[PDB]
Amino acid sequence: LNRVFIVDDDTLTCNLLKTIVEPIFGNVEAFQHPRAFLTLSLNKQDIIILDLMMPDMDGIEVIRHLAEHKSPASLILISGYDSGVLHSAETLALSCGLNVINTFTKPINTEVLTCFLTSLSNRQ
Amino acid sequence: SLNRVFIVDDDTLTCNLLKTIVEPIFGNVEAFQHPRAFLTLSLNKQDIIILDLMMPDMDGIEVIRHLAEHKSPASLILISGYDSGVLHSAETLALSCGLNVINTFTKPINTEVLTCFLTSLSNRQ
Amino acid sequence: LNRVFIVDDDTLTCNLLKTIVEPIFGNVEAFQHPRAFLTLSLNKQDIIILDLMMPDMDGIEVIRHLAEHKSPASLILISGYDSGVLHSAETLALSCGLNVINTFTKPINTEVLTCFLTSLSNRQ
Amino acid sequence: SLNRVFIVDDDTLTCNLLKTIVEPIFGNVEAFQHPRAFLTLSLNKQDIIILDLMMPDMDGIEVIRHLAEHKSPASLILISGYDSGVLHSAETLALSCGLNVINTFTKPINTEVLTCFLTSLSNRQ
Secondary structure, three states: OOEEEEEOOOHHHHHHHHHHHOOOOOOEEEEOOHHHHOOOOOOOOEEEEEEOOOOOOHHHHHHHHHHHOOOOOEEEEEEOOOHHHHHHHHHHHHHOOOEEEEEEEOOOOHHHHHHHHHHHOOOO | OOOOEEEEOOOHHHHHHHHHHHOOOOOOEEEEOOHHHHOOOOOOOOOEEEEEOOOOOOHHHHHHHHHHHOOOOOEEEEEEOOHHHHHHHHHHHHHHOOOEEEEEEEOOOOHHHHHHHHHHHHHOO | OOEEEEEOOOHHHHHHHHHHHOOOOOOEEEEOOHHHHOOOOOOOOEEEEEEOOOOOOHHHHHHHHHHHOOOOOEEEEEEOOOHHHHHHHHHHHHHOOOEEEEEEEOOOOHHHHHHHHHHHOOOO | OOOOEEEEOOOHHHHHHHHHHHOOOOOOEEEEOOHHHHOOOOOOOOOEEEEEOOOOOOHHHHHHHHHHHOOOOOEEEEEEOOHHHHHHHHHHHHHHOOOEEEEEEEOOOOHHHHHHHHHHHHHOO
């Protein structure tokens, strides 16, 4: 894994995630417009951090898009809207064959996300 | 009753099975093997939609997303494998988006339970 | 399946369930004290309708008891407290090897429960 | 730090593994292979409990039930297979009963992630 995309229309969340991610994965990019992110072809070395964006469901469209195109990228779902809903999206996305490797509720637990991202990197 | 029932399922066999169970009870039943064609329709409060989730594709999820964005008032029934929570996940997602999910059924379908449910549904119209 | 037990400290729920159940399974008994129900040895032909009884968790104790004793009975969980919690209890109880055949949120959907119980009976 | 850590897991091997990961970081660590003995203890706000769910028995669920009934103030970490939602179910149950679940870990355990987490946990004491 060598690149991270952050997909969230919340500017302050995108900044926070960039700051946590960049020391670990230097190649990180945030999108606040999912439509722009959906023009990229991703590969197996990409990690996507995706907010579900409820109750508008732009995140649900992103998951449908990635499933339709059989994306090989690793996916982390986040949401502050409702955790039963977050866990449902994870279940649905896995069952459609996407590689969801984790989920986090907002407000984000930054220590847990830090440990988890470190372990995905190739440090010793 | 005479409510419209729309069956949405791209599998011809399970689609036809649903149709044979519904038609003696709700004669105005129409089956769509192509979800996107179904999505051009605008539905009423009295319409009943039987939606196969069509796992492991995301076509069922797209119909839910479309229905929720247009705030469909129609009653919704979801069908799929129990699948360690897949049907419950879709139901939770759909209820959360403001959709009126009135029941779910695991596949393969218990036709006795479905016949019994649609019968009571008809009688309370 | 030939006997139904209803386990719920809510008297009005117990009455409602008895009235729905008895036309279908004549041998039905309700307990408002779980401790009394836990003195019975159940068999494979028993159906238990159990409220989780949150936030006190008497229902959780009933599930632990039935798991410890490897009860063969069929189990239906109900709760008006929180449906993510209801679905968690179902998941936990199945994974401990109990035969959970359904769950219902309160207020109970009486048409759905009626259809479901009918299908468990031996009518044609 | 010098918080007490209690490891509750009746499997001697996975128990010992947890213990070897915790002890360099929290020296005051005690492992219980018998949940009921652990349940005689009264815990403080600063205690950390690492609880194996011990599926497919219900011993982990009983510790959660006991802790919640006595309103334990201790921090709780839950360990188990992802198991199509089993760990998430226990976490949801425990949070709902008012317990302070600070993290969960799937088995088999990623010792790097656990070492990293307990290190930050120690540093924020």
